[PDB]
Amino acid sequence: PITGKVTAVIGAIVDVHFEQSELPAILNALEIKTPQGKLVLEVAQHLGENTVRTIAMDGTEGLVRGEKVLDTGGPISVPVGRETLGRIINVIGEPIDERGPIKSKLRKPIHADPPSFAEQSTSAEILETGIKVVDLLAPYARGGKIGLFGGAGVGKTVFIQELINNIAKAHGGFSVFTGVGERTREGNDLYREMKETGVINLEGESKVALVFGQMNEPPGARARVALTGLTI
Amino acid sequence: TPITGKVTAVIGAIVDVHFEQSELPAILNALEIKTPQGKLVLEVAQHLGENTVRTIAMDGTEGLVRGEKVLDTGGPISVPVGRETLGRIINVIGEPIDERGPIKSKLRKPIHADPPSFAEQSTSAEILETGIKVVDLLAPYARGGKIGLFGGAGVGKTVFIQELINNIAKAHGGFSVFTGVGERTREGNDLYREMKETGVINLEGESKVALVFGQMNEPPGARARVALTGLTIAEYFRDEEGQDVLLFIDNIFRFTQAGSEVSALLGRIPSAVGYQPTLATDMGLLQERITTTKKGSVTSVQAVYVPADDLTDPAPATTFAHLDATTVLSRGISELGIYPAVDPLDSKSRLLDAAVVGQEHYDVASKVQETLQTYKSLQDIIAILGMDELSEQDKLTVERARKIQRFLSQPFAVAEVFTGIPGKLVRLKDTVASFKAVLEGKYDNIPEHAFYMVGGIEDVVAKAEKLAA
Amino acid sequence: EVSSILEERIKGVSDEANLNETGRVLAVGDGIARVFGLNNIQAEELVEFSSGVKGMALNLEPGQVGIVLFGSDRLVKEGELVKRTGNIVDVPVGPGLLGRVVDALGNPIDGKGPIDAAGRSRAQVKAPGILPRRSVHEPVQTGLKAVDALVPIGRGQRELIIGDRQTGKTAVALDTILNQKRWNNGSDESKKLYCVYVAVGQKRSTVAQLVQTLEQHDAMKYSIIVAATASEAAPLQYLAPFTAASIGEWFRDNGKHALIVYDDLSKQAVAYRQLSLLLRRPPGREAYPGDVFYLHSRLLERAAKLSEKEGSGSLTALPVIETQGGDVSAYIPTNVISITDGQIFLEAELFYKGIRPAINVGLSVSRVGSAAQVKALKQVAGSLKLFLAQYREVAAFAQSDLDASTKQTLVRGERLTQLLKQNQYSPLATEEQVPLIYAGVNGHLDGIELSRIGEFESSFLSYLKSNHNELLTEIREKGELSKELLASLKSATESFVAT
Amino acid sequence: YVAVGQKRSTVAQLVQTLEQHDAMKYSIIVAATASEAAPLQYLAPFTAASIGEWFRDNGKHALIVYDDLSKQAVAYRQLSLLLRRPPGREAYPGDVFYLHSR
Amino acid sequence: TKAQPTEVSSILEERIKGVSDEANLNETGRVLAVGDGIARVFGLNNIQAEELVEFSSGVKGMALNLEPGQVGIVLFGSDRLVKEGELVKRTGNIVDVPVG
Amino acid sequence: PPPVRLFGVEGTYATALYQAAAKNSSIDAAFQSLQKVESTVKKNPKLGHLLLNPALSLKDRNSVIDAIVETHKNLDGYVVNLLKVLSENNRLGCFEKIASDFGVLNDAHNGLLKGTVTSAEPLDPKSFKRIEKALSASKLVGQGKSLKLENVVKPEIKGGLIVELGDKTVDLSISTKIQKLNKVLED
Amino acid sequence: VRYEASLRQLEQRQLAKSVISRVQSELGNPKFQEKVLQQSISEIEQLLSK
């Protein structure tokens, strides 16, 4: 089994030294067994001689040198399905919203390779919206990307809410709202508001899924929430 | 002496040799690596010891095996010099690139040459005339003077140098040396064709002009020693032969930039922003190798490219020490529809301090500078409101200074085509006269279009005739 | 079906061979790899790793070699065996690439079937000497005014296209390719262009839109598209103009004309920036390496017009710049500008205010790019270049003097600016553009007011062919106007102006 | 008169201007031209001072022009950074002040 | 590890031979690196700060850094004369000018 | 410069040692003694092998050295001075590093060539001999050069084999080939 | 037609994992041993001919 002992904790960069014929690849998930949780480390370099350099998904503070690490064999595998819709999830693929476990169906790696050239948009297809103002003066498209401008708390949050409702009528489609560096007070408000206006429910199946990466978690966990929502 | 070696490494384009015997070469000796391709000429810059040197590469390092032979020539790369260097184009390895074959020579000399001492000095600084108006008035050339132009191509760096050759080189006579340090390929071919068309060079007849041109697909170490190759040829003329010569250099930013690329690789820690630490010594050698001796006398004109138009950048700053006159050409002025694009407030010559250009010429140029500096001062007030919301005296001052700015545009004569206006050749003697009249209100009573793209005094009158109709 | 394609594949491979040298990697990652061994390797050789990924030798060091990875990090692992390809880094060249989409490696990535090649020739090569060069003589037609002869480009020029990115930057370039379709199907092979459009740093989605758009416009059968998109890693973007340019040179040394559009050289500078910093080389001025200059100058001088010896071949260039807000204080823009001659300064402000193309002509110049134009196209545009830089000065002070003469110039000038506009993605024919510039140059926009400029244009053209096509046959073949032809046009234009 | 970083041609114009104006009788030129290495450029102001302390000591009055001390820092920069000593501010070694003040 | 005089094969081969005297550490020492307009010498443990040391190619140069590895001697001239292996003898006089 | 380069990566000690010892002629002799002094360090089980990470002084290291030369004396006099150099730099864990390098350099001059023949199974002697014959025939081993072929069992190869020596390899492994083949067969 | 297109995709992955099962079956059998001898005699012919 590919196992090694921690031989450094320089910042949020934890280096694990592995033995012979026991070799990682870059992007794999390392899980350090601990009674304080688990910590997910992502291999972001090879420094050779069976040592690695990783980034962390959670606070590194209190690590001993000598604690066992185990290599999964590839990237963090996050839940997918219509059981993962109406759940707040941190990067690791587990509930932070505390409604017991998410019923695993299929799980899929967080890093995946860009789709083929013949499968990239060869034409613009116009994404339908109920907002008239949006469809005239700046057409949404199925391949395009539309960057909001304006303040926060000025109508933007409600505007985000509106769009979810149209998509349900238009296509049947869902959503995933991903928050990077989320402000943990505001997350409660938005979670409550979303459930109440019925774009999320405790009564069953849901549209928008929320993916939240708190700002008190290391830098790495902030980047990797963005790839985790997209896979859903 | 013969020194065998093998190529241990090729790190960047700063190859490392490991010699196979205890004999070792000195610093700035030249070495050749044998490949079925040709040769690569590299030049020792460090010994890192244990019989491992580090060498500057004047040829791209593609396809180099480790454990591959090198040989020692036993001294610095040797160019061919002579009076049979004329009509020729010389690269950097002393080989033609205009393919007239082996370059006939009596002496072949090392490219580095120890600078002329402070006992060989001409005190000369006699007026030489450009034949360009702006230049005659604000920064007239000199027998001992060094002129430099700065700022990015506006009118084309090269093209200005062409006018200079057109005018100054058919009335100075004798030898002229052109060294183009990592200059664009196409431009050299056009010039070669023009000299033969205009019967200056001829390969069937005489050649009182000589040439050195490099290429800017060449590797950084090579483009740095294009400058030295020309310079070896220049010294030979100045001293041994004792003839008075010109020099033109375009583009010498490219020397500095080539140095800055190799500086990192060698094992150096460079200066801030990125430029080399050896900038002051090296810039010192070139400009003290063009220093007049008591044989012949030379006058140089140098072009410097600025990638921000900031002359406070460390590479344009070191140029300034070795210059006693400048004729800065600015992009702004070109864009406005004024050709040439000389800035008139960043101009200088050593002879423009006093009556070294004669008292009358100094009075006319002194006042020109004052008028344009006032115009620049009132630029805000003009933009914000205008000139009728100023005092009556000032309004004249502004209008007068607007005729002066426009007046300075002289049509080019080997670029007549490119400007689109038939060239004017306006004498030093005429420029003083024309400018005298204009200051006293004698042509300041007729349109700002009778000042748009005009030469001397006569032309201003003639553009009134046109407008009237 | 699904069984058959797999059976074919498995049979088309065996993957058994006997090898020369190998390495086993030292410590891999950051888009640069450190390999242990490889003692007989040549410089810039191609290596192939056990992952399947291939790399180019950059640093040959006495005990280790540092390859650069053409591909994402994740595939490369530590302790993999690296085997010498035995050949220097090359890309297939030949005429089995025209209308096959390719990446910078030369792979078919949707393709239009596998890739066929005459030769391969090294990614990196250095351009011919000073001696085999010749000035331009033949005009590039864009089929858009304001470049047509107002700001001229010729065949072998290296004339620049500068502006702020995604103001419609790409369309100006397509039109060059599109407009050349009836001179590109000729029996004059010097007149044909074979064009390569290098897309560096753009969205893979845009490129797929672009591949389809050209096949609607029936122009993809004489162009290649090269890809090192934004998704695809930086060292492949670095190498993307170089690899494509080898393909361009192959057309140029068969003595036929070509074109290559380098979109965007500012993104080559970024691609090369990231690779450079992760190798420990300290940033230069504007946080970009100081060896950026080297890449662009070497790159650009392999597009040049050759002499009679080389078959009077050419490879023209239109290098496309992403400007940092219309500033030219920045390092990367000036570096491309100082190597090149001519600029096609383009304005965002103008694009917004209904000037399509929005080709400002104040900071647009031609130096040696001005001997491109044949006589018809020197006559008609005569001194229009000059007149609309008298117009700029006339409008600085039209916030002093107000005279009929200044007012007259300003009215002509505005009217003239309106006239330059032309529909995009159907570029108006060159023969068709010759009468229209005559009118305006000869001051005949003192009878047309601004609102009606578009209307006059089509009605004037329709009129001219039905009345007298003699005039137009002359310009198609002769391509030089005579005084008599000129007068005949003047006589016709005034007739149309009245009524 | 101290001349650091300058071309010989420039110095050559000055010395002739002085001899005409009758005043190379008492003038001494300490020079270190730019072609000549960085240590000699650097040592040039400093040996100039010592030649002054003797005049100053003896009861004589003199004037020392130090043109230019900005190229002195630059010279000192070349040697220090190739002897690999850490930089002060702007790449100029931080002990430049000690040279200038002494 | 990092350069010390044990990372250079010419110094070390001799150390193994039990020669670490022979007065390469008194008044003299042997050049080991040259280039860039800078020199470095091995030895010179009776050196004074700011002293002049004469390179045996007729070039004399002052010394501004003293280290037990490589005493860093700044050159007053040519790199094409000064070359590696040669001996340098300490002048024994700090740099000086005639006053008069 | 002595034959065979191996300077750098602490291999500068070995090169220096090799040449310094070549000129008296006691490289085999020295090598034998360096391995022997090294072995009685390893079988020292009271912090002479159990501590090789430096944390000792100049002076406490000098009395660790004196303890090492107490064990047997007569190693020659070059490799006894070598101990001193290593001591002065205070690297006790880069003692065996040199020993292995000096061994590599020694057996190159003698000409004995170390290779490797990875498999996952411990292959017959017949096959060993048939490989030793094939290598000897090839330009891979000349003459006056000996051949040692060492099979190791690695889990990372699973089926097939690869021969390796002189950074030259012939790879008929099944494991690499099955992987590359699997990849093209997901297409 | 869309479902048929998908069916082709489905087919391609199904047929993949079956080959992964047979790799495990081959390495499980003493074919692991019958085939290493084969590698050996091929490698012998090849290395002999460098």
mmCIF file of all heavy atoms in Angstrom, chain B residues 132-192, unseen atoms left out:
data_model
loop_
_atom_site.group_PDB
_atom_site.id
_atom_site.type_symbol
_atom_site.label_atom_id
_atom_site.label_comp_id
_atom_site.label_asym_id
_atom_site.label_seq_id
_atom_site.Cartn_x
_atom_site.Cartn_y
_atom_site.Cartn_z
ATOM 1 N N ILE B 132 19.155 69.612 -42.578
ATOM 2 C CA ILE B 132 17.810 69.531 -41.998
ATOM 3 C C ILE B 132 17.705 70.771 -41.132
ATOM 4 O O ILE B 132 18.707 71.167 -40.586
ATOM 5 N N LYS B 133 16.532 71.374 -41.148
ATOM 6 C CA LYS B 133 16.351 72.661 -40.564
ATOM 7 C C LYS B 133 16.456 72.585 -39.074
ATOM 8 O O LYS B 133 16.983 73.479 -38.422
ATOM 9 N N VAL B 134 15.740 71.586 -38.443
ATOM 10 C CA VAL B 134 15.495 71.555 -37.085
ATOM 11 C C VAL B 134 16.780 71.332 -36.365
ATOM 12 O O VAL B 134 17.091 71.854 -35.322
ATOM 13 N N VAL B 135 17.537 70.449 -37.041
ATOM 14 C CA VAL B 135 18.798 70.034 -36.596
ATOM 15 C C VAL B 135 19.855 71.140 -36.638
ATOM 16 O O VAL B 135 20.571 71.328 -35.697
ATOM 17 N N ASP B 136 19.906 71.961 -37.743
ATOM 18 C CA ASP B 136 20.810 73.061 -37.861
ATOM 19 C C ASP B 136 20.572 74.052 -36.870
ATOM 20 O O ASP B 136 21.556 74.504 -36.309
ATOM 21 N N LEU B 137 19.311 74.405 -36.599
ATOM 22 C CA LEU B 137 19.015 75.373 -35.552
ATOM 23 C C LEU B 137 19.266 74.943 -34.081
ATOM 24 O O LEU B 137 19.804 75.693 -33.304
ATOM 25 N N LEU B 138 18.790 73.702 -33.692
ATOM 26 C CA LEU B 138 18.666 73.348 -32.273
ATOM 27 C C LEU B 138 19.821 72.566 -31.801
ATOM 28 O O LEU B 138 20.079 72.626 -30.590
ATOM 29 N N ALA B 139 20.479 71.790 -32.612
ATOM 30 C CA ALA B 139 21.576 70.862 -32.229
ATOM 31 C C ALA B 139 22.457 70.571 -33.403
ATOM 32 O O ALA B 139 22.681 69.408 -33.731
ATOM 33 N N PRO B 140 23.111 71.628 -34.005
ATOM 34 C CA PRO B 140 24.014 71.465 -35.203
ATOM 35 C C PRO B 140 25.167 70.539 -34.907
ATOM 36 O O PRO B 140 25.703 70.536 -33.755
ATOM 37 N N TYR B 141 25.463 69.627 -35.874
ATOM 38 C CA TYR B 141 26.456 68.592 -35.789
ATOM 39 C C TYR B 141 27.765 69.223 -35.766
ATOM 40 O O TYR B 141 27.952 70.493 -35.926
ATOM 41 N N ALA B 142 28.762 68.377 -35.356
ATOM 42 C CA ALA B 142 30.109 68.809 -35.052
ATOM 43 C C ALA B 142 31.067 67.769 -35.427
ATOM 44 O O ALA B 142 30.628 66.628 -35.613
ATOM 45 N N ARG B 143 32.402 68.076 -35.608
ATOM 46 C CA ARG B 143 33.560 67.304 -36.095
ATOM 47 C C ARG B 143 33.967 66.332 -35.026
ATOM 48 O O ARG B 143 34.403 65.169 -35.375
ATOM 49 N N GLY B 144 33.769 66.723 -33.791
ATOM 50 C CA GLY B 144 34.022 65.894 -32.651
ATOM 51 C C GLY B 144 32.830 65.453 -31.881
ATOM 52 O O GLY B 144 32.940 64.519 -31.056
ATOM 53 N N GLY B 145 31.676 65.995 -32.110
ATOM 54 C CA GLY B 145 30.428 65.786 -31.463
ATOM 55 C C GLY B 145 29.865 64.388 -31.485
ATOM 56 O O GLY B 145 30.036 63.673 -32.437
ATOM 57 N N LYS B 146 29.048 63.910 -30.464
ATOM 58 C CA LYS B 146 28.336 62.668 -30.554
ATOM 59 C C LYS B 146 26.890 62.937 -30.338
ATOM 60 O O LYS B 146 26.531 63.503 -29.322
ATOM 61 N N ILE B 147 26.102 62.487 -31.306
ATOM 62 C CA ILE B 147 24.702 62.828 -31.351
ATOM 63 C C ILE B 147 24.027 61.514 -31.044
ATOM 64 O O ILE B 147 24.513 60.480 -31.476
ATOM 65 N N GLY B 148 22.823 61.509 -30.427
ATOM 66 C CA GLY B 148 22.026 60.355 -30.162
ATOM 67 C C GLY B 148 20.649 60.833 -30.198
ATOM 68 O O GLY B 148 20.309 61.990 -29.898
ATOM 69 N N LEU B 149 19.783 59.937 -30.584
ATOM 70 C CA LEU B 149 18.382 60.121 -30.836
ATOM 71 C C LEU B 149 17.823 59.045 -29.930
ATOM 72 O O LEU B 149 18.436 57.963 -29.815
ATOM 73 N N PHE B 150 16.670 59.316 -29.337
ATOM 74 C CA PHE B 150 16.121 58.431 -28.386
ATOM 75 C C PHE B 150 14.688 58.426 -28.745
ATOM 76 O O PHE B 150 14.246 59.146 -29.650
ATOM 77 N N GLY B 151 13.869 57.592 -28.027
ATOM 78 C CA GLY B 151 12.512 57.324 -28.307
ATOM 79 C C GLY B 151 12.268 56.380 -29.461
ATOM 80 O O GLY B 151 13.087 56.146 -30.330
ATOM 81 N N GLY B 152 11.082 55.774 -29.395
ATOM 82 C CA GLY B 152 10.701 54.731 -30.226
ATOM 83 C C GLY B 152 10.450 55.112 -31.665
ATOM 84 O O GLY B 152 10.196 56.280 -32.004
ATOM 85 N N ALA B 153 10.499 54.095 -32.585
ATOM 86 C CA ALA B 153 10.230 54.498 -33.934
ATOM 87 C C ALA B 153 8.892 55.240 -34.155
ATOM 88 O O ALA B 153 7.837 54.716 -33.893
ATOM 89 N N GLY B 154 8.912 56.449 -34.783
ATOM 90 C CA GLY B 154 7.736 57.267 -35.020
ATOM 91 C C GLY B 154 7.721 57.360 -36.510
ATOM 92 O O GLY B 154 6.840 56.857 -37.151
ATOM 93 N N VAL B 155 8.757 58.030 -37.066
ATOM 94 C CA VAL B 155 8.943 58.174 -38.438
ATOM 95 C C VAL B 155 9.715 57.077 -39.043
ATOM 96 O O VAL B 155 9.944 57.075 -40.296
ATOM 97 N N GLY B 156 10.087 56.077 -38.210
ATOM 98 C CA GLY B 156 10.894 54.986 -38.594
ATOM 99 C C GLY B 156 12.292 55.438 -38.236
ATOM 100 O O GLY B 156 12.861 56.392 -38.827
ATOM 101 N N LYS B 157 12.921 54.670 -37.348
ATOM 102 C CA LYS B 157 14.301 54.976 -36.815
ATOM 103 C C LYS B 157 15.273 54.981 -37.932
ATOM 104 O O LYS B 157 16.216 55.765 -38.081
ATOM 105 N N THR B 158 15.062 53.932 -38.760
ATOM 106 C CA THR B 158 15.964 53.687 -39.822
ATOM 107 C C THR B 158 15.935 54.763 -40.850
ATOM 108 O O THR B 158 16.973 55.169 -41.387
ATOM 109 N N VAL B 159 14.703 55.191 -41.203
ATOM 110 C CA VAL B 159 14.409 56.088 -42.301
ATOM 111 C C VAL B 159 15.096 57.465 -42.084
ATOM 112 O O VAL B 159 15.630 58.106 -43.051
ATOM 113 N N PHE B 160 15.153 57.943 -40.871
ATOM 114 C CA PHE B 160 15.794 59.196 -40.516
ATOM 115 C C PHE B 160 17.222 59.154 -40.819
ATOM 116 O O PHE B 160 17.726 60.042 -41.395
ATOM 117 N N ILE B 161 17.883 57.936 -40.470
ATOM 118 C CA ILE B 161 19.282 57.671 -40.682
ATOM 119 C C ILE B 161 19.562 57.730 -42.203
ATOM 120 O O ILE B 161 20.504 58.359 -42.659
ATOM 121 N N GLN B 162 18.557 57.201 -43.022
ATOM 122 C CA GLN B 162 18.641 57.320 -44.491
ATOM 123 C C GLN B 162 18.690 58.689 -45.055
ATOM 124 O O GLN B 162 19.528 58.927 -45.929
ATOM 125 N N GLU B 163 17.916 59.668 -44.520
ATOM 126 C CA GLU B 163 18.010 61.028 -44.948
ATOM 127 C C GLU B 163 19.400 61.577 -44.675
ATOM 128 O O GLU B 163 19.988 62.362 -45.416
ATOM 129 N N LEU B 164 19.987 61.211 -43.531
ATOM 130 C CA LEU B 164 21.225 61.695 -43.042
ATOM 131 C C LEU B 164 22.389 61.330 -43.921
ATOM 132 O O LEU B 164 23.184 62.188 -44.304
ATOM 133 N N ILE B 165 22.302 60.056 -44.406
ATOM 134 C CA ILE B 165 23.189 59.495 -45.411
ATOM 135 C C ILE B 165 22.993 60.211 -46.729
ATOM 136 O O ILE B 165 23.894 60.477 -47.465
ATOM 137 N N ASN B 166 21.743 60.524 -47.076
ATOM 138 C CA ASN B 166 21.507 61.160 -48.359
ATOM 139 C C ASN B 166 22.144 62.496 -48.531
ATOM 140 O O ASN B 166 22.647 62.827 -49.623
ATOM 141 N N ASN B 167 22.060 63.318 -47.425
ATOM 142 C CA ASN B 167 22.533 64.664 -47.369
ATOM 143 C C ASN B 167 24.030 64.776 -46.978
ATOM 144 O O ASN B 167 24.809 65.311 -47.735
ATOM 145 N N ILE B 168 24.393 64.342 -45.781
ATOM 146 C CA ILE B 168 25.704 64.459 -45.202
ATOM 147 C C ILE B 168 26.697 63.598 -46.026
ATOM 148 O O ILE B 168 27.824 64.055 -46.238
ATOM 149 N N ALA B 169 26.384 62.372 -46.583
ATOM 150 C CA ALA B 169 27.368 61.474 -47.144
ATOM 151 C C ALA B 169 27.750 61.837 -48.587
ATOM 152 O O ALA B 169 28.695 61.265 -49.118
ATOM 153 N N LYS B 170 27.035 62.827 -49.232
ATOM 154 C CA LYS B 170 27.381 63.196 -50.615
ATOM 155 C C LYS B 170 28.066 64.498 -50.628
ATOM 156 O O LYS B 170 28.130 65.115 -51.665
ATOM 157 N N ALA B 171 28.472 65.007 -49.437
ATOM 158 C CA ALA B 171 29.073 66.336 -49.307
ATOM 159 C C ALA B 171 30.214 66.372 -48.216
ATOM 160 O O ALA B 171 30.787 67.411 -48.025
ATOM 161 N N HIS B 172 30.447 65.176 -47.611
ATOM 162 C CA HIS B 172 31.493 64.893 -46.677
ATOM 163 C C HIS B 172 32.522 64.061 -47.481
ATOM 164 O O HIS B 172 33.718 64.233 -47.259
ATOM 165 N N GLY B 173 32.036 63.307 -48.522
ATOM 166 C CA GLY B 173 32.895 62.506 -49.359
ATOM 167 C C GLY B 173 33.519 61.401 -48.550
ATOM 168 O O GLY B 173 33.100 61.149 -47.421
ATOM 169 N N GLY B 174 34.620 60.828 -49.083
ATOM 170 C CA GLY B 174 35.388 59.821 -48.343
ATOM 171 C C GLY B 174 34.587 58.685 -47.719
ATOM 172 O O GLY B 174 33.453 58.382 -48.093
ATOM 173 N N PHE B 175 35.304 57.980 -46.754
ATOM 174 C CA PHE B 175 34.766 56.715 -46.189
ATOM 175 C C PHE B 175 33.640 56.918 -45.214
ATOM 176 O O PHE B 175 33.613 57.932 -44.511
ATOM 177 N N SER B 176 32.680 55.924 -45.142
ATOM 178 C CA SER B 176 31.661 56.003 -44.139
ATOM 179 C C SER B 176 31.425 54.570 -43.700
ATOM 180 O O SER B 176 31.398 53.730 -44.524
ATOM 181 N N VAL B 177 31.134 54.354 -42.411
ATOM 182 C CA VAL B 177 31.009 53.015 -41.923
ATOM 183 C C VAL B 177 29.634 53.036 -41.362
ATOM 184 O O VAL B 177 29.220 54.032 -40.765
ATOM 185 N N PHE B 178 28.914 51.890 -41.661
ATOM 186 C CA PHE B 178 27.599 51.666 -41.147
ATOM 187 C C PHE B 178 27.700 50.408 -40.350
ATOM 188 O O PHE B 178 28.174 49.420 -40.934
ATOM 189 N N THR B 179 27.219 50.429 -39.090
ATOM 190 C CA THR B 179 27.233 49.197 -38.305
ATOM 191 C C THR B 179 25.842 49.189 -37.848
ATOM 192 O O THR B 179 25.374 50.107 -37.181
ATOM 193 N N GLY B 180 25.124 48.087 -38.100
ATOM 194 C CA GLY B 180 23.745 47.914 -37.712
ATOM 195 C C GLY B 180 23.739 46.708 -36.831
ATOM 196 O O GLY B 180 24.148 45.625 -37.250
ATOM 197 N N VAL B 181 23.394 46.912 -35.545
ATOM 198 C CA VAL B 181 23.577 46.003 -34.446
ATOM 199 C C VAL B 181 22.191 45.438 -34.308
ATOM 200 O O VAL B 181 21.240 46.090 -33.794
ATOM 201 N N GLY B 182 21.924 44.128 -34.782
ATOM 202 C CA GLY B 182 20.660 43.386 -34.674
ATOM 203 C C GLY B 182 19.495 44.004 -35.234
ATOM 204 O O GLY B 182 18.418 44.091 -34.642
ATOM 205 N N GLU B 183 19.757 44.522 -36.449
ATOM 206 C CA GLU B 183 18.854 45.199 -37.274
ATOM 207 C C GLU B 183 18.151 44.270 -38.239
ATOM 208 O O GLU B 183 18.699 43.266 -38.774
ATOM 209 N N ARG B 184 16.858 44.651 -38.442
ATOM 210 C CA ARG B 184 15.858 43.894 -39.223
ATOM 211 C C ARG B 184 16.396 43.659 -40.690
ATOM 212 O O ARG B 184 17.007 44.506 -41.373
ATOM 213 N N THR B 185 16.080 42.399 -41.141
ATOM 214 C CA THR B 185 16.704 41.831 -42.344
ATOM 215 C C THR B 185 16.413 42.587 -43.680
ATOM 216 O O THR B 185 17.318 42.803 -44.435
ATOM 217 N N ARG B 186 15.077 42.950 -43.850
ATOM 218 C CA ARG B 186 14.540 43.454 -45.068
ATOM 219 C C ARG B 186 15.171 44.804 -45.428
ATOM 220 O O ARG B 186 15.442 45.133 -46.599
ATOM 221 N N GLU B 187 15.378 45.633 -44.315
ATOM 222 C CA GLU B 187 15.813 46.972 -44.421
ATOM 223 C C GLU B 187 17.219 47.150 -44.984
ATOM 224 O O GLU B 187 17.510 48.016 -45.803
ATOM 225 N N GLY B 188 18.076 46.297 -44.594
ATOM 226 C CA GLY B 188 19.481 46.179 -45.117
ATOM 227 C C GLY B 188 19.492 45.917 -46.604
ATOM 228 O O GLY B 188 20.222 46.555 -47.347
ATOM 229 N N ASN B 189 18.625 45.003 -47.123
ATOM 230 C CA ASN B 189 18.538 44.730 -48.559
ATOM 231 C C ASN B 189 18.063 45.901 -49.414
ATOM 232 O O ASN B 189 18.598 46.136 -50.453
ATOM 233 N N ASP B 190 17.073 46.684 -48.892
ATOM 234 C CA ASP B 190 16.586 47.872 -49.554
ATOM 235 C C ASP B 190 17.692 48.906 -49.688
ATOM 236 O O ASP B 190 17.771 49.517 -50.763
ATOM 237 N N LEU B 191 18.505 49.094 -48.624
ATOM 238 C CA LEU B 191 19.615 50.159 -48.551
ATOM 239 C C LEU B 191 20.673 49.776 -49.559
ATOM 240 O O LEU B 191 21.152 50.664 -50.255
ATOM 241 N N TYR B 192 21.034 48.471 -49.669
ATOM 242 C CA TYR B 192 22.122 47.943 -50.514
ATOM 243 C C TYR B 192 21.865 48.257 -51.997
ATOM 244 O O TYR B 192 22.749 48.690 -52.741
#
